[PDB]
A paper describes a structure:
To obtain a more precise picture of the GDGT–MAS active site and a better understanding of the reaction that the enzyme catalyses, we determined a 2.05 Å resolution structure of the M. acetivorans lipid-exchanged GDGT–MAS in the presence of 5′-dAH + methionine. The [Fe4S4]C is 8.0 Å from C16 of the phytanyl chain, which is close enough for the transfer of an electron from the substrate radical intermediate to [Fe4S4]C, or perhaps even close enough for [Fe4S4]C–substrate bond formation.
A central RS domain contains a partial triosephosphate isomerase barrel fold and site-differentiated [Fe4S4] cluster that is common to all RS enzymes. GDGT–MAS forms the biphytanyl chain from substrates containing fully saturated lipids, indicating the formation of a C–C bond between two inert sp3-hybridized carbon centres.
Numbering used by the authors: -1 to 375, 380 to 397, 402 to 499
The structure:
Amino acid sequence: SHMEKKTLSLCPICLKRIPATILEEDGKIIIKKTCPEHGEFKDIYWGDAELYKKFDKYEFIGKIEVTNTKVKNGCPYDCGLCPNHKSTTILANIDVTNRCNLNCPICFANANKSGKVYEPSFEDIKRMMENLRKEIPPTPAIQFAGGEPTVRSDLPELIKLARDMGFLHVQLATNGIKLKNINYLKKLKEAGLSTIYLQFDGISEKPYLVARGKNLLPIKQKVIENCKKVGFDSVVLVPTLVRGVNDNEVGGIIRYAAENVDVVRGINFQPVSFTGRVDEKTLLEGRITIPDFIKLVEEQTDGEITEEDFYPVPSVAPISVLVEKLTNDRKPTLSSHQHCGTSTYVFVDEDGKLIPITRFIDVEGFLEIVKEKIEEIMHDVKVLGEIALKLPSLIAPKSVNIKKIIDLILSVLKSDYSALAELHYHMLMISCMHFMDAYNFDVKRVMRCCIHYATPDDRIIPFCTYNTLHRQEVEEKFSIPLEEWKRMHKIGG
Ligand SMILES: CC(C)CCC[C@@H](C)CCC[C@@H](C)CCC[C@@H](C)CCOC[C@@H](COP(=O)(O)OC[C@H](O)CO)OCC[C@H](C)CCC[C@H](C)CCC[C@H](C)CCCC(C)C
Ligand SMILES: CC(C)CCC[C@@H](C)CCC[C@@H](C)CCC[C@@H](C)CCOC[C@@H](COP(=O)(O)O)OCC[C@H](C)CCC[C@H](C)CCC[C@H](C)CCCC(C)C
Ligand SMILES: C[C@H]1O[C@@H](n2cnc3c(N)ncnc32)[C@H](O)[C@@H]1O
Ligand code: MET
Ligand code: SF4
Ligand code: SF4
Ligand code: SF4
Ligand SMILES: [Fe+3]
């Protein structure tokens, strides 16, 4: 064995803060911890030690300025955001309901299993948005979740509100069932929705039977069909990855998304996180980590995408630092922990093969130049020109006009969000974020968390502490018993 780090974790029994050791063992990264009352625990932290060490070099420590709570009990008990948090809200979640038209066996929110209805008012949601916009820099992206947001009749008005509040990106996490109605999808599109974060467990029926309790695959494909018909070209497929259920369909999901790249902008795989409601078989067997996913991509894409093509999230953090000094304005920085997730971008050519952007562009060299020019940054245009002149030396699909890609990359360096958006329409994002549970919790990771829930009590809580420590507290305070809520609201709320 070989000790890598010391950190703090949580006891899976009593959720107490306990010491933890991260160590290399048989080519894998495991985490060991000891609760003074419940003994010692062991879990797989990362399935590949070599990729763990490689990602460790992209560490980036951010900074916050606007807080909502104070230091009282220490991390992870002071969410949030307390003075010791190291990242501002990049993507915010607002749970608009705990009601749902499904009853999935796997659900980190554990919806419908409380006998109480949590549905913040339009005015509560606007106040939560104001808290998010008060940050420095203001939160640029917001996602409605739950729960199933489409069971609220005012969801189009909520989407319009997010646009009126200044959010550049408005996202909808949904099972997509109500989106089989093409007129409703039109209402969401006209309301200003940016992206549909679509639950999508596989390309065959069995993953939906195991994870959702029924075959939703025809409904999923109908949603994709309706998105083509109305021109909604920003869909992200979200497979909950479970070993023994859909780890064999990683390539199939990618290939199906590539066939529909006109509407599908990405696939964000989510390894099953043992929070909320998990069936006893998935809880015991289906533990999979980020490098295990990277291995599945390389195996099930026949080498088209390799482990060299995947980068951690904070690798692009210096890009925001460069634009920040280039414009003298605070920019949202992807300062999450290097072991929270990974991503790559691929182009789809004529035959259908997948060319990662790392295949024909020296991304590691581009980031190297960006880091070099941060110290040096009339001279700023020369720096941009030097970058513009050094970009051809770091460069491929024939159907890709590489000259417009260069212009969009350089425009992104000028805080041009519309260039960032247009650049994503040329590519297919393949990513994976592994949310922590009580078994693999790492305080050093969650301190840099960039994905936060806005709560009705004026707090902003990192995703991984909210779903392990805070969700029941918050929802119970602001919920109404089901029997009384039904008798005071219509089916739409
Ligand atoms: C270069 C490589 C080596 C990799 C480098 C590192 C890599 C980590 C960098 C990643 C950067 C990336 C996240 C940046 C995304 C920017 C992008 C969203 C900007 C907008 O990009 C354009 C959007 C569409 O937006 P519009 O054009 O405004 O609206 C069009 C509208 O439909 C009009 O009808 O499509 C595009 C849609 C996007 C693709 C959507 C991305 C969504 C995220 C993946 C969502 C992540 C969610 C979290 C895991 C939280 C989940 C919470 C849940 C569990 C409740
Ligand atoms: C060029 C090639 C070779 C390499 C890089 C490829 C490229 C596609 C990567 C892009 C990475 C970006 C972070 C870079 C953007 C850089 C910014 C400085 C651009 C600034 O312009 C947009 C600013 C808004 O600024 P103002 O409000 O002041 O006008 O951020 C507003 C935009 C922000 C970024 C909103 C982001 C929205 C999404 C939904 C947030 C997701 C958050 C997750 C933590 C990330 C996903 C993680 C994976 C593992 C799922
Ligand atoms: C918001 C997205 O999260 C997915 N999802 C639901 N439960 C879990 C879990 N335990 N782990 C990971 N992802 C999950 C949903 O299927 C939806 O697509
Ligand atoms: C707990 S998941 C909440 C979002 C939505 N119900 C989905 O499954 O995609
Ligand atoms: S996760 Fe962040 S906000 Fe929450 S207690 Fe830790 S440092 Fe503070
Ligand atoms: S995972 Fe989503 S769709 Fe399934 S029960 Fe939970 S909230 Fe509803
Ligand atoms: S939500 Fe969890 S996995 Fe994602 S950045 Fe925050 S702490 Fe890391
Ligand atoms: Fe304990």
